[PDB]
């Protein structure tokens, strides 16, 4: 069936939040090698 | 002309001959070859494709 | 051309008689185009009517085996003709011949309505309307 | 087709015409009977040319595939034969 | 009386005629040696042949195939001798085709064939054939599924006759008699054939009384190239097809190509990629539908090394 | 001219027979005339 | 439809007569080369 | 401020990382260089390629084909330069596929693709792609059929990121955003990928949040032989297939073979029968159905003689 | 199953039995319950063996086709490579 | 064995009690075989009856689009099951489910009678007889 | 948001752009090559497959 | 033994997953163990 407008607004917010969490992970990846460097220097 | 019982028996003969040829014709050819070939191949080699 | 077009446009805009002469010719042509369309439809309608009449003269099989074979042949013929846009009339006749032999034409019509193209259905629908004997 | 009916378009004006109307007036310049008959021939001419191009294209494909399908194996078979002739001649 | 028979035979011998061969071969030079019809196939094919002897001939063959109407597997074995030849081949489904030819006399041959189909019912057949090969003529009679069980003669019967008229011209006759069931009348058909044969070219024709006509012409184009053309007409509707083709004999490969009036093009390339291996590539292109069937195959013979000393027995009745 | 030939060559009940026969006529001439030996070999 | 017995007898006779005419032609063929020989000797 | 940016960049440079390449290539060594999936075909195929120059690259190509979902004819032409690359190919039916890549910067590339379908309606598409290639990472964004005509963003959008963690380990991310129609809610999917790369072997994986998993492993078996194995799992039902295959690099031919857990076997043989001609034979056997698809093809390049002096332009953005 | 019903077969004779009856009597020797249960196992055993032969046959075909389809192109490609190695080594 | 067989044959021929003992065992076995057959048919009849009952619990679609999709699916399922001799009961149920959804079951039965194998039709015929609600 | 007339005009622009790319894209590539190739091929050779 | 393995290997909802995973396990070992280099080259 066709969705209601508030359900659409709920989906639109959820989807945006998912991609925002993805870009947050991407930023971690861009910063990840320096973290891995520390591990070799921790021992 | 022909008796119905005779036709039944004759038809049975064809069915029997059919079964024998179906099962026995190929083994017969291999037997003729295996026993008459020059030289005689090994039983394993007799039906090996390329070994 | 532009000088003539400007004079033509000026005359058309300011001279009502110039428009009236042109409009009369335009109106006359509009009439001819409508008359031409009507003549073509009536002639096409006659071919559709003729096709049903032609099928009546050829007759239909009476035996169940011949009816089934004829039905399948007409369906096969209809499908084969349906691929040619020039045979829409011929395709509808084959569907009509089969439909007339099928025991439940109403059920077969629903199949044609879904499996046969509308241009053939349009001819076939008029064939059905012309053959008031179709059950 | 009555003079009184046509008389209804008694008045016209150059400024009243819309840009689309002035552009549409350009098509009105051509006689409708002639333009309709010319357009018909245009359709017939374009269809005939397209059929010709399809036939010419289909023909070129047929000859092209024929030369490849027959000439390719042949050129290799004939070519390979020539090598044996060359090697045999060196003896 | 022998007095006339001897004089008749002597008068016959002085004409210098020769045996024209089987009727089905009057077009062999075209229908099999030039046209691709008998070699065309699709999909993959592989023949593993083991030869155990050459006199007597004895070989075992495994055919693997995956294509249109090709059986996934076929086992075949054959035995041959100057006086006899027995062959059998069986499909994975048990369909067994057999052959048995025996020479009661160098001029007389009996040919027996069988085709057995198991639990699934495909009609099984029996074909008995008798051939005579005189000094200047050949006679043949066939009986397919001959039966008298119904109290009357039934089955299919064929009579064939071919006569050499001159050292180059051959004329023949064919007669058919059929009766699928005693409840229906027997059907008979006659066909006339003829051939004119010379060293460089051969022309043959086969005219059915029904109206069908098959004619072919073959000509040699040098030591390595030969070509032929075949025409077939049918009047069952009126239909006719004409096939033109050529064959090339290179040292290590044989190339065949043909085209016909129906727009079909086909070629077959057989290449000896190795001493025991022969490759086959076959392609058939239908220009009206732009569809092509590709066939790739291989044949392997591995028994030659021991077999080199021997020699094939002569005149095996293949 | 063409009308008397095209009809018997492309739009007749025997068009296939004539086309097959005509094709045969050329092929035989092409072989027998020696052109094929000069072309295919 | 199924044939009547007299029609079958008519067909059986016709078919036999056809093959008998064929064998008559075959005999001519067997005798044909001597006829052709005469033609070369007629001139 | 540049003070930190410079220090950050310097600290970044001292790690010795390198560009990991496009996300779609983390399995290239397996999915294209070893497995046959990208080379399999059926029927006949023939490519007639004419090369007119090497710098700038310019070549015209004619492909003839007759087989399953193969267009009878395809004309293709392409032009390339160190800064740009334009390609177009058109089917006999007018279906036109195009590509246009331009280097605005050596580290930035724009990729445009089109697919036009004439009177018959097959959806026509437009794909815009932007790629960035840093010293140690790659970023990518795609927009397929992007439209705002309905007053809201529509079409398909893809974001891709791949980061080199160590000189051998690469980790990445993938994000999808979709909205086929404004009347329905947008759908988004994320996929995680990663790769560990060494001189002798490379292992990669692609895990969808939906549950599907694609993993592959590649290893070199000497100078002329390499093989790899690919596993794919789906949980849409639970389904999985594992493919094992190897590739052989002879002097004049390259042979590929693979087998998978679904019983399929396929092989592809490419052989340089001549300097401009390359043959391809492809066969796929489905052991559960015993059916085989055969493909035979040829490629011809005839422009080299004049072209010998020149040299291909470097880093053409293919 | 009544003694009076079974008593109807009061009299029998060796000569009265037909050749077919005497031959049929041989089958009557085997107990019907056992022979019926043995025949059932015979059917199950014959079906299982036929399934095994079909599987073994289908397996041999699979391995045979695999070795040919992969080994044949490979043997030629590998073989052809060896010739170039031999010709190059003679330099 | 032959000596025992001759004694057995002699006893069977001349001793009525020997025949009676054997005949009683034979008669007893004949009864058991009939009783076994009857039990299998009734159990099979229950499965057929159960299959119609099971279809009633699952229900049938009411909308035309769902009915058409379900009909095609059941026909596709029936044909797919018809290839397996172990699914004759399942095939008949699919044909039954489709037949129950088809608007003119009588016409579809004539199609099944020609396209469906008799072993499935035999089960399907009993399914029809059990489902007295089938029109 | 967006005017319906604007959407009609914008949609028309896509249709026009679609037609131009369909007909003009391939001739454009040949023009770039033909005018920029080194050397410049003959007009007949420019699209010859192998001659 | 086999009953606890065959069920999870040939007659389960995930039989295809296990079969694909197991096949992968062998292939990787076959490559990494060096046997492939000793066999395929
Ligand atoms: C040179 C003669 C041909 C020049 C090009 C003609 C193109 C005509 C056409 O529509 O072709 C599509 C045709 C297909 O025609 P078709 O009729 O099958 O499909 C098109 C149908 N309409 C027109 C309604 C959309 O393609 C071919 O036949 C092959 C074209 C390439 C031929 C070989 C080129 C390379 C060798 C020289
Ligand atoms: C139309 C057919 C075109 C075939 C494609 C082109 C073949 C190009 C050959 C190039 C070559 O290597 O030439 C070798 C040679 C070239 O050299 P040459 O032999 O002409 O002269 C040099 C001779 N020496 C070296 C001894 C000094 O030509 C031939 O031998 C050509 C023979 C004809 C082969 C044509 C293909 C097969 C034809 C089969 C015909 C049967 C019906 C086919 C139906 C379909 C075709 C109509
Ligand atoms: C000596 C041993 C080697 C030669 C074996 C020859 C076998 C000849 C046929 C044997 C019986 C086949 C049969 O009855 O089929 C009927 C059945 C048909 O099903 P059915 O058994 O239900 O029907 C039987 C029907 N009647 C009783 C009338 C015969 O088919 C099969 O069993 C299929 C396989 C047939 C044989 C396949 C080829 C031979 C085996 C492989 C090659 C030999 C090994 C190579 C290594
Ligand atoms: C040699 C021995 C004689 C034939 C053995 C059986 C051959 C069976 C066969 O292939 O077909 C049955 C055939 C004929 O079978 P039929 O007459 O029972 O008919 C069944 C076959 N169709 C339906 C195709 C006609 O056997 C004969 O030909 C028997 C008569 C010749 C006896 C000498
Ligand atoms: C410079 C000349 C050489 C390069 C030619 C490039 C041609 C590009 C496409 C031309 C237009 C095609 C077209 O509109 O197709 C729509 C029609 C579809 O039918 P339609 O015309 O009814 O639909 C048109 C739809 N619109 C208006 C939206 C575009 O298709 C064809 O006409 C079929 C053939 C297409 C082209 C085939 C390949 C090119 C010709 C052969 C290769 C060139 C010669 C080689 C020798
Ligand atoms: C480059 C110029 C912009 C695109 C020119 C037209 C390309 C047309 C095409 O291939 O698809 C139409 C596409 C989209 O077409 P659309 O939005 O009209 O939808 C029709 C296509 N389907 C059904 C598949 C969605 O054009 C665009 O993407 C236009 C927006 C991008 C403009 C920059
Ligand atoms: C060695 C193992 C195999 C020995 C022969 C087994 C024959 C079994 C059988 O019925 O085969 C038919 C099968 C087909 O089995 P099928 O099950 O597809 O068909 C037969 C079905 N029934 C039994 C009901 C009739 O053929 C094969 O699978 C190929 C047989 C030849 C295998 C290769 C032989 C040459 C190389 C060694
Ligand atoms: C199972 C595969 C069997 C392939 C068929 C048999 C190949 C016989 C080769 C004969 C030969 O010439 O040997 C060359 C040589 C024989 O000599 P050699 O190299 O072993 O030793 C001599 C070396 N010299 C000469 C330098 C002293 O063997 C090989 O190199 C074999 C390499 C393996 C090739 C096997 C075929 C391709 C395998 C692809 C694997 C990927 C998955 C395939 C899936 C399907 C198969 C499971
Ligand atoms: C059953 C049907 C009967 C017709 C037919 O089968 C079908 O039977 C063949 C009869 C043949 C002709 C007979 C003789 C000659 C003389 C010869 O002269 C060469 C020179 C030579 C003698 O002078 C000295 O070298 C040229 C050919 C020609 C005309 C034949 C043409 C083909 C014909 C018509 C054949 C045709 C196919
Ligand atoms: C029944 C059908 C009717 C049509 C047809 O048969 C079939 O009728 C046949 C007549 C044949 C020609 C007869 C003679 C020659 C002369 C020869 O040249 C060397 C002659 C030599 C003399 O000294 C030096 O000149 C070359 C061949 C050629 C032209 C024949 C070609 C094929 C033709 C046209 C045949 C054609 C197909
Ligand atoms: C997104 C997902 C994350 C996991 C994954 O992608 C998917 O990412 C990779 C991480 C890899 C491991 C990382 C490091 C090592 C150490 C190395 O040690 C060799 C000796 C060397 C160092 O001591 C000195 O020469 C052996 C291999 C191993 C264990 C890898 C195994 C494969 C793994 C698990 C790969 C796996 C496919
Ligand atoms: C188990 C089943 C039977 C066997 C089989 O699997 C299935 O096993 C494979 C082994 C293959 C052969 C191995 C090596 C060669 C030598 C090569 O090189 C010639 C060089 C030339 C130089 O002058 C002469 O020496 C020619 C081909 C040949 C014979 C192969 C043929 C195909 C064969 C027989 C395959 C066959 C299908
Ligand atoms: C996630 C899935 C679970 C199952 C699985 O991954 C996928 O888990 C992995 C463990 C791997 C083994 C690890 C180490 C070795 C030792 C090496 O020998 C040289 C060692 C050297 C030390 O100095 C000299 O001894 C040869 C290869 C081998 C046996 C691997 C084979 C593949 C295995 C079994 C993989 C298997 C497929």
Numbering used by the authors:
A (entry chain E), G (entry chain F): 8 to 50
B (entry chain J), K (entry chain I): 21 to 71
C (entry chain L), J (entry chain K): 22 to 156
D (entry chain D), I (entry chain C): 28 to 118
E (entry chain B), H (entry chain A): 21 to 256, 265, 267 to 347
F (entry chain H), L (entry chain G): 16 to 56
Paper text:
The translocase of the outer mitochondrial membrane (TOM) is the entry gate for the majority of proteins imported into mitochondria as precursor proteins, or preproteins. In humans and fungi, the TOM core complex is a membrane-embedded dimer of twofold symmetry, consisting of two copies each of the β-barrel Tom40 pore, the α-helical Tom22 receptor, and the small α-helical structural subunits Tom5, Tom6, and Tom7 (3). Two other preprotein receptors, Tom20 and Tom70, are loosely bound to the TOM core, forming the TOM holo complex. We determined TOM core and holo structures with and without the bound MTS of rat aldehyde dehydrogenase (pALDH), revealing numerous interaction sites with the Tom20 receptor and the Tom40 translocation pore.
Visual comparison of the corresponding maps from both preparations revealed no differences, indicating that incubation of the isolated complex with pALDH does not induce major conformational changes. For this reason, and due to their significantly higher resolution, we focus primarily on the pALDH-bound TOM complexes, noting that any interpretation of the structures may equally apply to the complexes without bound preprotein. We generated a difference map against the unbound TOM holo map that highlights the presence of the preprotein and its binding partners. Further evaluation by 3D classification of TOM without bound preprotein revealed that Tom20 adopts various conformations, consistent with our results on the N. crassa TOM. We discern four conformations of Tom20 in the absence of a preprotein. Nevertheless, we confirm that Tom20 adopts four conformations: two central, one bent and one extended.
